[PDB]
Amino acid sequence: RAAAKFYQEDIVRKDDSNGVILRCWQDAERPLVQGEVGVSYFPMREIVPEDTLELVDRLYQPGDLLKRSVDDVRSGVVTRTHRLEHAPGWKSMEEIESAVEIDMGEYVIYNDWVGQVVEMFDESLPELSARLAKHTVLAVAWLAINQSLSPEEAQGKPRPQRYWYGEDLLTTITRKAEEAMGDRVKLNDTLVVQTRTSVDVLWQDGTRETMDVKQTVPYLNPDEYDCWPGDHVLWKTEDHKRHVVVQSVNAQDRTAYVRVVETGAVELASVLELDPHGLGVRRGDFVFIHREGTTNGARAPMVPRIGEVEEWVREAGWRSEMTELGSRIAEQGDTSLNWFGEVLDLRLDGTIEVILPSADTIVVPLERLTRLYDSVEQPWKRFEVLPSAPVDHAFYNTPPAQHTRQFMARMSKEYKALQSSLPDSILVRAYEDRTDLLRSLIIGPENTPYEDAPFVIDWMLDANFPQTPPIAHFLSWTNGNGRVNPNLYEEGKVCLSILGSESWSASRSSLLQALVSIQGLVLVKEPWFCEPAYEKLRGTEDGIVNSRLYNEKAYVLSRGFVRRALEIPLGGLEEELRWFYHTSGKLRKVLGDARALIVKSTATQGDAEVPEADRERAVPRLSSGGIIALERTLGKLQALQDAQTATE
Amino acid sequence: RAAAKFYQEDIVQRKDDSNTFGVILRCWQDADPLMRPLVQGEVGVSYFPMREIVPEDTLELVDRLYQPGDLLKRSVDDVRSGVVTRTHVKGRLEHAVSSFSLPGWKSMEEIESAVEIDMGEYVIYNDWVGQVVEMFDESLVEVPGGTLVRLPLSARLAVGEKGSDRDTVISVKHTVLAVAWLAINQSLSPEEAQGKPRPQRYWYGEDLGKLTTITRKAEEAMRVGDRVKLKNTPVTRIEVDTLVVQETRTSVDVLWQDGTRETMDVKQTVPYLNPDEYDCWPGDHVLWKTEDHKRHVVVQSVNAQDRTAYVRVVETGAVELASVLELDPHGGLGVRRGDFVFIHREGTTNGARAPMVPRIGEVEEWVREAGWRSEMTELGSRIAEQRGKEGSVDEVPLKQAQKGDTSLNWFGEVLDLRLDGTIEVILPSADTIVVPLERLTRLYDSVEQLEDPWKRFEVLPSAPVDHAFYNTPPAQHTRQFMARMSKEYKALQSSLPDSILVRAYEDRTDLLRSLIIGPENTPYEDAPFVIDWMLDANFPQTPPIAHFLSWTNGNGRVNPNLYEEGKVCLSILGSESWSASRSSLLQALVSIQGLVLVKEPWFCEPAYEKLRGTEDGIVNSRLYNEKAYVLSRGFVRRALEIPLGGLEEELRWFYHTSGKLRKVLGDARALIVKSTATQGDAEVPEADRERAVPRLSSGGIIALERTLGKLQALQDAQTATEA
């Protein structure tokens, strides 16, 4: 047990009466300890434990996710966000206006174009680089054009002025998430803020209730299948990928009620069979508005981006010309702007509510929008040497590298090193006609979500091997839902340091140590922590729920590997797979242990008290929502065993 | 120019003190303060019985080392080469420990070898063959004052020492012999194969008499310093009848390429170190690419001047002329002189296809370990302590060495390659047999295994299907990959020469395609060279993967660094090694054009880099530029016959629209006429020097005319489409 107290970007009150914001905690990319967080009090930055500071206010935004506690499976989305040094009491969010004229990166509008300010030139008491708390010169990098026009009108409007100064500066676009946030704002000559916040929360089960931020906890690491009411997701049944709109989600049962938009009816769906991820329209995204009849130019709910910054932004030349112009300066309602706006709210009836710059909220369909892309942040032998390489190999149709003369010396050593310490769970097959291609098969360890599951990797050695690491292509036998492991990509890339902390070296690294690393580091009991951004939460209390929701996902997709392994034939491993699953009786174990696991889950259908004896079991209890998808794979796994028993 | 004499491994003599002889180990331009780099006209030499590096002018030739199977010429300027078929050696002798020179020169027919066996020799037990890899030999040493004291170790000792002062070795007795067995007799049936086991690892004592020594006739050529003995004839002291060769005089029987034979003095000849890939000799089995079917022929004669050869098709039995550029020999692919082979049973074949030679060697892993020698050292010390007392057996130094007609006629040495395709093989029984090539199987020795409209850059929409890496699984790269390629795409559009074209793709940015036009006055003049590129998963930290589309046939490569299998050989592709900081993708393109496509591409091989303009490499240079020219014109055919995805109209603008196809056909037919007029003249014209290819040989015109016929029909169909 190791609960986390303070989270990033909120405000914290240790000793004296008259706070601070913290930029570090248990989540780290100065290393921290099991209970200390970074901090930076400023009216210096120290590293104090969490036992000293106290919470005063937490910062949320319309679109962020939170829970009542880190153990509560139910999550919610924020819909709206609700003492100051003069350099009586408080002041509401509507009793103070931001006197900050222009900020770095704020969107502007001119003609029918839209851009962002990349550089500024303030002059107070010199003019340079800004970042001080009167801007004079602004450098705009115009992005896209208004999507509400005709090609004759589109080609007319060109790229406007790249530098703005003097009397030419208009339409300043505000964000409904940047208001009421150390800012400089007055109204009855400046006032600086030093706050109380409450957020209107929309829970997953449809319930909406407003609460204080001191009781809530941010949900920074959501599950890939987590959705919220109003979101446009994709219902991926094995028959077809249908478009549905989420209405309610029962995170405890891992089920959801979605409206099939082609049918208009609400049907119960398994959350594991919903693939939201980008596709949709998140709350707070700036989007264009097309015209009636005209669409987004896209297909089923997948609004496109329209960002297109010029190249002169990626340089650090142009700064000398902008600085020379700025130095010469100090010496001597309603409108037609209805084609742009940010996402305000997502209605349950599949309609998106857009707020125009003229404070005019409008409701538009998803197909009439276009997302904005700003600058942003951019019989069981372990080893054998088979004669011919299989045609189903990933690199069979890949030009073979020539290597050198001493390459066969290392391969002779690797072949022995494999045959020496290869466990009976990992199988390797080499080919003489293709000395550059290898194929491995790793059986999932015991008491893991990958228990008794096949994992085939096709290998290729570069012309510089062993100086270069072996190129591994993982055969991900998923139906396009997600990755069976955070490191094992669906595209085939195996994400490890051994195949690239340490690296690959011909002096220490080897093919044997790489295979046992994949079985030892990747295929573990809690594979959710294999993601590098989650490894800092080993056994911590705030990483318990996410490990359960992932081990369940890994256990369901692991059985799908047994489906494809017994369906499509693996070249050189066909007889090896039948000896394991059909001869030694492993398919009966996979079907049997899953059947007993489904039965034990229907007993404790309403009981949330996991038995203390079932602890450390990789997947102790099933969700009854993920069981819905497991019965589909088991139904095909049972049908293959039916044809096997009928053969004899 | 820069002539070079004194090739490695012969015998020389200083201009002064004409009593000392040299061993000449380090030769000028080959690859402690000694073993340093040597400059133009400097050779290293050790002296029998004080190493120094002296200029070549100070020393003087005495004798030269030639073995049956080696190649030689009268001079480096001569195009016609030959092969040594027999080596006669006469030498002066001197007692090893008495230092008494016997008067008169003696032949190898009246002397024998003093050492019974040495390292690397072959031995046969049961029906197995093995090689001695390590020896434990306890020897005697004559102390300063009497005392023939014994000494136990690691071989490498012979009769005659130099230091615990100036002591003389009186005897060298090999006790334990570590034999690395290779394979068994290939004539025995598979049932009898398991009945014969892999013999012991160590051999000593009374077990030595069961072995069978195999003497190599190619090594029986008497060398300087060898420990030899006169056949029944100075004894000095235990008797010590061991002599040391003072100097030698070698005469060789040569088989020239033109079928003629003559005996020469080795002082007149010059060893043919690096021969052309197409160099054949009478009696050799080669492949002939006549059209679309490689045939089995036996070389009868070779005209090295006209670069043609008379071959005998074994399938038909007729003798036909063939261009030496069309022959594709040596791939091993034929039995050479001095090689050891396994005579198969009557009827049984080599198991391989058209003239191929099966390999035999199977060096056990204990030979490469590092160990078992500690057990051999403890074994040799145990032998010495017990050899004096009772219950111990030693010596028995027989090891067969048969001279009658024993059943050892299943494994022998290749003596001569007859013109009728048959191979003369000498058995250990000192009797020769004639056998076809199919009945033989070469022995892979253990020492052999241990040693071995135009634009410049346009981002095309889609990558074509003819791309080499179109079927490869794409990687994922890093985040800062498109930013790196943006700088790479900018660097290409910055300083790309008009002779190199690069086309990237949008549907998958990990693949690129390049095309280089060979510079003027090069064997690649106005020729297409397309390389398919793929970016690695760790790019740019890792070098880019380049696959050269070698449109050659099964003859050879268009360049020593451009393999027929696509591998481009350059240190810049992982010069300096690949670097993500300094090195870029652009400089990898201009280096391939600037370094791989030069005027004399034969020197692109790093081994031949030390030969630049020297009178040695002048012949092999023009021999290679001729091939590089014929294969370059063949690339124009493969570039217009099939289209290249992306370069579809870029090729038509350059060859058909810009008229470079008539430029290639015009320049080629001009070289045909100039080669016909200068034909016969052994000397190269003066005004035609500094030209990449001044002349084409008679055989070089043959292979080029076949490409010109297909290059003319493409010009015919182009001029016929004027409707």
PDB file of C-alpha atoms in Angstrom, chain A residues 311 314 377-378 394-395 397-402 405-406 412-413 416 460 462-464 468-469 471 473 489 491 493 499-500, chain B residues 365 368 451-452 468-469 471-476 479 486-487 490 534 536-538 541-543 545 547 563 565 567 573-574:
ATOM      1  CA  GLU A 311       8.477  26.262 -41.892  1.00  0.00           C
ATOM      2  CA  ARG A 314      10.989  25.820 -36.732  1.00  0.00           C
ATOM      3  CA  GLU A 377       3.874  20.022 -28.838  1.00  0.00           C
ATOM      4  CA  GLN A 378       5.413  19.436 -32.266  1.00  0.00           C
ATOM      5  CA  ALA A 394       7.425 -11.252 -41.932  1.00  0.00           C
ATOM      6  CA  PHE A 395      10.722 -10.711 -43.780  1.00  0.00           C
ATOM      7  CA  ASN A 397       9.677 -11.060 -49.071  1.00  0.00           C
ATOM      8  CA  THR A 398      12.398  -8.710 -47.680  1.00  0.00           C
ATOM      9  CA  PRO A 399      15.765  -8.441 -49.469  1.00  0.00           C
ATOM     10  CA  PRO A 400      18.292 -10.538 -47.544  1.00  0.00           C
ATOM     11  CA  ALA A 401      21.311  -8.786 -46.086  1.00  0.00           C
ATOM     12  CA  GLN A 402      24.772 -10.073 -46.974  1.00  0.00           C
ATOM     13  CA  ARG A 405      32.295 -13.712 -43.237  1.00  0.00           C
ATOM     14  CA  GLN A 406      32.539 -13.693 -39.425  1.00  0.00           C
ATOM     15  CA  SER A 412      27.297 -20.714 -34.538  1.00  0.00           C
ATOM     16  CA  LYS A 413      27.766 -19.331 -31.020  1.00  0.00           C
ATOM     17  CA  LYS A 416      24.689 -23.192 -29.171  1.00  0.00           C
ATOM     18  CA  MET A 460      15.702 -10.323 -39.046  1.00  0.00           C
ATOM     19  CA  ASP A 462      20.855  -6.472 -40.298  1.00  0.00           C
ATOM     20  CA  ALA A 463      23.953  -6.407 -42.484  1.00  0.00           C
ATOM     21  CA  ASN A 464      25.744  -4.934 -39.438  1.00  0.00           C
ATOM     22  CA  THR A 468      23.102  -3.592 -34.723  1.00  0.00           C
ATOM     23  CA  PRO A 469      20.308  -5.151 -32.633  1.00  0.00           C
ATOM     24  CA  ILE A 471      15.056  -6.500 -35.879  1.00  0.00           C
ATOM     25  CA  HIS A 473       8.548  -8.002 -35.691  1.00  0.00           C
ATOM     26  CA  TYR A 489       2.679  -2.951 -30.496  1.00  0.00           C
ATOM     27  CA  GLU A 491       2.330  -2.783 -35.730  1.00  0.00           C
ATOM     28  CA  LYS A 493       7.466  -3.167 -32.966  1.00  0.00           C
ATOM     29  CA  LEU A 499      16.408  -4.453 -28.724  1.00  0.00           C
ATOM     30  CA  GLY A 500      17.641  -0.883 -29.226  1.00  0.00           C
TER      31      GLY A 500
ATOM     32  CA  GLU B 365      34.346 -27.388 -31.192  1.00  0.00           C
ATOM     33  CA  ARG B 368      38.296 -23.543 -31.079  1.00  0.00           C
ATOM     34  CA  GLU B 451      41.431 -18.714 -41.297  1.00  0.00           C
ATOM     35  CA  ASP B 452      38.088 -17.816 -42.896  1.00  0.00           C
ATOM     36  CA  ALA B 468      12.976  -3.793 -52.861  1.00  0.00           C
ATOM     37  CA  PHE B 469      11.678  -2.910 -49.382  1.00  0.00           C
ATOM     38  CA  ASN B 471       7.226  -5.869 -48.881  1.00  0.00           C
ATOM     39  CA  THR B 472       9.192  -5.321 -45.674  1.00  0.00           C
ATOM     40  CA  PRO B 473       7.371  -4.672 -42.381  1.00  0.00           C
ATOM     41  CA  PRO B 474       7.666  -0.940 -41.676  1.00  0.00           C
ATOM     42  CA  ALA B 475       9.229   0.272 -38.445  1.00  0.00           C
ATOM     43  CA  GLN B 476       7.970   3.012 -36.108  1.00  0.00           C
ATOM     44  CA  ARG B 479       9.430  11.320 -32.760  1.00  0.00           C
ATOM     45  CA  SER B 486      12.976  17.417 -43.105  1.00  0.00           C
ATOM     46  CA  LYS B 487      16.616  18.424 -42.664  1.00  0.00           C
ATOM     47  CA  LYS B 490      16.355  19.988 -47.363  1.00  0.00           C
ATOM     48  CA  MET B 534      15.209   1.963 -46.454  1.00  0.00           C
ATOM     49  CA  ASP B 536      16.175   1.831 -40.108  1.00  0.00           C
ATOM     50  CA  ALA B 537      14.130   1.825 -36.910  1.00  0.00           C
ATOM     51  CA  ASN B 538      16.955   3.639 -35.079  1.00  0.00           C
ATOM     52  CA  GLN B 541      21.737   6.717 -35.302  1.00  0.00           C
ATOM     53  CA  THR B 542      21.899   3.620 -37.553  1.00  0.00           C
ATOM     54  CA  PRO B 543      23.111   3.784 -41.166  1.00  0.00           C
ATOM     55  CA  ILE B 545      19.887   0.411 -45.632  1.00  0.00           C
ATOM     56  CA  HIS B 547      20.052  -2.241 -51.782  1.00  0.00           C
ATOM     57  CA  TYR B 563      27.551  -6.825 -54.985  1.00  0.00           C
ATOM     58  CA  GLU B 565      22.994  -9.251 -54.109  1.00  0.00           C
ATOM     59  CA  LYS B 567      24.895  -5.000 -50.598  1.00  0.00           C
ATOM     60  CA  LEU B 573      26.956   3.109 -44.734  1.00  0.00           C
ATOM     61  CA  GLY B 574      28.090   1.537 -41.449  1.00  0.00           C
TER      62      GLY B 574
END
